[PDB]
């Protein structure tokens, strides 16, 4: 399913990587005018956060301002675990537990973002776990503490290990090994796999995880045998 928890609160998607969350500035709508338009008679609907549009995973979307008010103020306090799963090139270092650089972001013609590591930007942490290691990459667990745009995309490449599929910060040649280990991979490998808040009507902590879809499954499959 797409809608995978819905109450009078809160809706969470697992948003499909390929739509953006929204539309841009030019004539084009993603997952909550889409929204909007199954659901016309909606009295409140907004995204609580973004993802990118080549992501996938956990979306929190606000049916209530109640709901918006007290799902803000828990990122603004970075109360939520944000846990993604991303394949990155070559070894992840085991002792690089977080990555500190501060992210300048811009804004292109097209209304494409794009995020630089610069004394001029700001302040950004990104934690991670190894997972899974494989013959020429990394599966690792990917966690912003703050919550920049492209900030997980950004910092990796950064420490020297870009992720799997990353048109703007990533690498053509990881990609190349990647088709021709025959991992199946086309998207961008960056997974909001999972979140973890507290529910803003019960007051209940509540952790939602997203299935990763059978593209990032089979590149798995694959890496796990790659040697």
């Known amino acids: 399913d797409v809608i995978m928890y819905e109450d009078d609160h809160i809706l969470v998607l697992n948003k499909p990587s390929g739509t953006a969350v929204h539309g841009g500035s030019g004539l084009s709508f993603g997952v909550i005018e889409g929204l909007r338009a199954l659901r016309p008679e909606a009295r409140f609907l907004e995204l609580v956060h973004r993802l990118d ?19 803000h103020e828990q990122l603004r306090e970075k109360g939520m675990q944000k846990d993604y799963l991303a394949l990155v090139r070559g070894q992840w270092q085991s002792h690089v537990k977080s990555v500190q650089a501060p992210l300048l972001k811009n804004i292109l013609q097209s209304g494409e ?9 700001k302040p950004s942490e990104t934690r991670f776990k190894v997972e899974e290691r494989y013959a ?35 690498d053509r040649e990881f990609d190349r090994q990647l088709t021709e280990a025959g ?16 529910h803003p009507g019960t007051g ?24």
Do not use: W
């Open 53 to 71: 549009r080549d992501t996938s995973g956990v979306l929190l979307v606000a049916k209530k301002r109640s709901a918006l008010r007290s799902l």
């Open 204 to 227: 209940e902590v509540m952790r939602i995880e997203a299935p990763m879809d059978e593209g990032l499954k089979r590149c798995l499959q694959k890496m796990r045998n790659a040697r």
């Open 136 to 170: 020429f990459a990394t599966l690792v667990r990917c966690s912003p503490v703050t919550g920049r745009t492209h900030q997980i995309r950004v910092h990796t490449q950064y420490a020297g290990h870009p992720i799997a599929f990353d048109d703007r910060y990533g």
């Open 183 to 198: 991992t199946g991979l086309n998207r961008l490998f960056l997974h909001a796999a999972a979140l973890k808040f507290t």
């Open 113 to 121: 973002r794009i995020v630089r590591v610069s004394q001029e930007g």
